């Protein structure tokens, strides 16, 4: 993916802030009295399991 943003000039250094909209989600399991186990997912822009 390529994106070109055209923007007005500013006398100070600035940042383009992008939000790639995504499904960032978790599921949480609690099978025994002493424990909690979380499964994460982020569908585009993933970070594993």
């Amino acid at each position: 993916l390529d994106m070109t943003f055209e923007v007005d000039p500013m006398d100070e250094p600035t940042l383009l802030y992008l939000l790639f909209e995504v499904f960032d989600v978790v599921r949480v399991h609690q099978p025994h009295r002493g424990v909690i186990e979380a499964v994460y997912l982020r569908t585009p822009f993933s970070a594993g399991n």
Binding site: F45, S46, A47, G48, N49
Partner: protein, 81 residues
């Protein structure tokens, strides 16, 4: 009579010995993962209060991802083992 010719099959690609990563193929059985002081300003943003005796680095080395971009990704071994 006729000859019996049993079928071939593909070993399971997320098998019990698979070593998964999101952007590439699964490796199997063994690899290397490397814990090295990656200097560049993207990872130096985590070095700031630190020194070489206690530091945060990225083990993810997919060269078209910048070290910041790659740092949030994950290496993900088979949960059955």
């Amino acid at each position: 009579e006729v000859p019996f010719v049993p079928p071939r099959y593909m070993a399971p690609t997320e098998g019990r010995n698979s070593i998964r990563y999101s952007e590439l193929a699964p490796q199997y059985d063994t690899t290397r993962v490397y814990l090295v002081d990656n200097k560049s300003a993207d990872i130096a943003s985590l070095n700031y209060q630190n020194d070489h005796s206690n530091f945060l680095t990225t083990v993810v080395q997919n060269n078209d991802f910048t070290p910041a971009e790659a740092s949030t990704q994950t290496i993900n071994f088979d949960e059955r083992s």
